[PDB]
Amino acid sequence: ADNIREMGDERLGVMVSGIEKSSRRLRNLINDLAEFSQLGRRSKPLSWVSLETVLNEVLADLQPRITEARAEIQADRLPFARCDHNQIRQVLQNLIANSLKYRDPARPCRIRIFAQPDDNAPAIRICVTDNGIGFDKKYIDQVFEPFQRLHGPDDYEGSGIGLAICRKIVQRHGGRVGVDTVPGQGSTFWFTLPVS
Amino acid sequence: GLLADNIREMGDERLGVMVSGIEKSSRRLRNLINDLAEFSQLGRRSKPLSWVSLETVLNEVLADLQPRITEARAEIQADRLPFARCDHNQIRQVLQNLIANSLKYRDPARPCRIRIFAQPAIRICVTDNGIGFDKKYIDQVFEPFQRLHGPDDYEGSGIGLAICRKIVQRHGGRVGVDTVPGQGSTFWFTLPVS
Numbered sequence: 001a002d003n004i005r006e007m008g009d010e011r012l013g014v015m016v017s018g019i020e021k022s023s024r025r026l027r028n029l030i031n032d033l034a035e036f037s038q039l040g041r042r043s044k045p046l047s048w049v050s051l052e053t054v055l056n057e058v059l060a061d062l063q064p065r066i067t068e069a070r071a072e073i074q075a076d077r078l079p080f081a082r083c084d085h086n087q088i089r090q091v092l093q094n095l096i097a098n099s100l101k102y103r104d105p106a107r108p109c110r111i112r113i114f115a116q117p118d119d120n121a122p123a124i125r126i127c128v129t130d131n132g133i134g135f136d137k138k139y140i141d142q143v144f145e146p147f148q149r150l151h152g153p154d155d156y157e158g159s160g161i162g163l164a165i166c167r168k169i170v171q172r173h174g175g176r177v178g179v180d181t182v183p184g185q186g187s188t189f190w191f192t193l194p195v196s
Numbered sequence: 197g198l199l200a201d202n203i204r205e206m207g208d209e210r211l212g213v214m215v216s217g218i219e220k221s222s223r224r225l226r227n228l229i230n231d232l233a234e235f236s237q238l239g240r241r242s243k244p245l246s247w248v249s250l251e252t253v254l255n256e257v258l259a260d261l262q263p264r265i266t267e268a269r270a271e272i273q274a275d276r277l278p279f280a281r282c283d284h285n286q287i288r289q290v291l292q293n294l295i296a297n298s299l300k301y302r303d304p305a306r307p308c309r310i311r312i313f314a315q316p317a318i319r320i321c322v323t324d325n326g327i328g329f330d331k332k333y334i335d336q337v338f339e340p341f342q343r344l345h346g347p348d349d350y351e352g353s354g355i356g357l358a359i360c361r362k363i364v365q366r367h368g369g370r371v372g373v374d375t376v377p378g379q380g381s382t383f384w385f386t387l388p389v390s
C-alpha cells in the first residue's frame with residue numbers, strides 16, 4: 001500500500017512544470033534567433049539617417065515597458081549617422097530594454113541616451129547609461145558574449161543573445177562596443193559608429 | 197477506501213500515453229534542429245569542385261546506411277558510378293537522402309529492391325521497389341516541411357529532398373523523378389562535365 005503515490009504526485013508536478021519552463025525558454029531562443037537572423041537577410045546598404053527618429057521609434061515600442069517601470073528617459077538629440085536604420089534601432093532596443101530589465105526596485109530608474117565625439121575617421125559614439133543594479137566589473141569582457149549569463153534563470157529570464165547581437169551589428173558598421181559598470185550604482189553601454 | 201486507488205488505475209494508463217507522446221515530440225523536434233544545423237554546416241563546408249570518384253561516394257553512403265539496410269532486408273544493385281567534378285561531402289549528402297528516403301518509404305509486402313545506376317550531362321538515378329507517390333503531390337514532395345505522410349507510420353523531417361535540390365543546383369544540376377504508385381519510384385539528379 002502506497003503513501004508513496006501521494007509523494008510521487010508532488011514530484012511529478014515539479015518535473016512536468018520543469019519541462020514546461022525548460023521548453024518555454026527554448027521557444028524564446030527559437031524566436032530571438034529567428035527575428036535577429038532575419039535582420040541580416042533584410043540588410044540594406046548604409047545611408048545617412050537621423051538617429052533621433054530611430055531612437056523615437058524605440059521609445060514607442062517600450063512605451064508599455066517604460067511605464068511599467070515608472071522610469072524616466074532623458075533623450076538627447078542624436079545626429080545623423082551612416083548606418084542601417086532597422087539594425088541600429090535594435091541596438092538601441094536591446095540596450096534600453098536591458099536598462100529597463102535591470103532597473104533597481106529601490107530608486108526610480110533613469111535612462112539617458114547621450115551622444116559624444118569619442119577618440120580611439122572620426123566616429124560618433126552613442127552611449128546609454130542607466131541607474132540599474134549593474135554587474136561585477138570582472139564581467140565587462142564577458143557581458144558581450146552569448147548565452148553567458150551572470151545569474152541563474154530564477155531571478156531574470158533572458159536568452160543571452162540580445163547584447164551579443166548588438167556587438168555584431170555594431171561590428172558590421174565598423175564600430176566597437178564597450179561598457180562601464182558600477183555595481184549597485186548603474187551600468188552604461190555604448191557603441192561607436194564610423195563616419196565614412 | 198479503495199476509491200483512493202480505483203482512481204489511480206484509470207489515470208496511470210493515460211499518463212504513460214501522454215508522457216510517451218511528449219517524448220516522441222522531443223525526439224522529433226531534436227531531429228529537426230539537428231538536420232537544420234547539419235545543413236548550415238554543409239554550406240559552410242563548401243569546397244571548390246574537383247574530380248571525385250562517384251562510386252567511392254556511393255560506397256561511403258552505403259557504409260553508414262548498412263545498419264539501416266540490414267534492418268530493411270532489401271537488395272542493392274550497386275552499379276559503377278563514374279567520376280564527376282563536384283563536392284564530395286555534399287554529393288555524399290545527396291546520395292544518403294535519396295537512398296535513405298528510398299529505404300524509409302519501402303513496402304511491407306515486398307522485399308524492396310534498389311538500383312543505383314547512372315546513364316548519360318551525367319544523370320545518376322536511384323530506382324526503388326518501394327512505395328510510390330501520386331503525381332498530384334510532386335510539388336509537396338519537393339517542398340520543405342511538407343511531407344506526404346503523418347509522423348506515426350513514417351518518421352522524418354521533411355527537408356530531405358529540398359536539401360538535395362540546393363546541393364544539385366549549386367553543382368548546376370537538376371532534380372527529377374518518375375513515380376508509379378504502389379510499384380516504386382526512381383529519383384534522379386544530374387552533374388555537369390567540364
Ligand SMILES: Nc1ncnc2c1ncn2[C@@H]1O[C@H](COP(=O)(O)OP(=O)(O)OP(=O)(O)O)[C@@H](O)[C@H]1O
Binds near residue numbers: 094130149162163187
Ligand atoms: N543595464 C544592465 N545592467 C546590468 N546588467 C546588464 C545590463 N545590460 C546587460 N546586462 C547583463 O547582460 C547579461 C546578458 O545580456 P543580454 O542583453 O545579452 O541578455 P538578456 O537580457 O539575458 O536577454 P535577451 O537576449 O532576451 O535580451 C545579463 O545577464 C545582464 O547581466
Ligand SMILES: Nc1ncnc2c1ncn2[C@@H]1O[C@H](COP(=O)(O)OP(=O)(O)OP(=O)(O)O)[C@@H](O)[C@H]1O
Binds near residue numbers: 293342
Ligand atoms: N522513395 C520514395 N518513394 C516514395 N515517396 C518518397 C520517396 N522519397 C521521398 N518520398 C516522399 O517525399 C516526401 C518528402 O521527402 P524527403 O525525403 O524530402 O523528406 P522526409 O523523408 O519525410 O524527411 P527527412 O529526409 O528530412 O528525414 C516524403 O514524405 C515522401 O512522401
Ligand SMILES: [Mg+2]
Binds near residue numbers: 094095098162
Ligand atoms: Mg536584452
Ligand SMILES: [Mg+2]
Binds near residue numbers: 293296
Ligand atoms: Mg530523407
